Fold 30S ribosomal protein S15.
Amino acid sequence: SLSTEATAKIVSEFGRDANDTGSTEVQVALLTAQINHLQGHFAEHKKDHHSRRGLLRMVSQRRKLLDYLKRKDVARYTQLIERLGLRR
RNA sequence: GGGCGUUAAGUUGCAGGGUAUAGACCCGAAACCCGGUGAUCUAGCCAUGGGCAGGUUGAAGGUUGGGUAACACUAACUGG
Ligand SMILES: [Mg+2]
Ligand SMILES: [Mg+2]
């Protein structure tokens, strides 16, 4: 999965600090990063269905976090998806 | 005894009757063989040139939008 240096880095970018490791914004950024990396993986390994079910979980899971955030603080939500360049 | 012979003059011209070989009384095939002449018609090919008013249909491809985690997909447009 994501590297410990690349994980720690995002938590810095989207968290209240280094240890704000479970905030919604952070969780959704980390999922985003791993989804986009894996875009590369399945480009070459289309037949890796098992791994894909794991990717699909990261997606459905990010979707639930984004909805919760939207419900609880739409302003925090808009920033977060624009910043992550999502929704189109 | 029997067969063929012995006891009939022939031959050379000339005219004629027939026959033979020859086109052989005249005309007439379809064809077979040999050597030439023809692709200015037409068949196919080769080189080099020319021609197809006007009106339709609107493939692939491309752009944008929506869409998808990403592809799929989908609309309009463009394209010809
Ligand atoms: Mg492992
Ligand atoms: Mg005599």
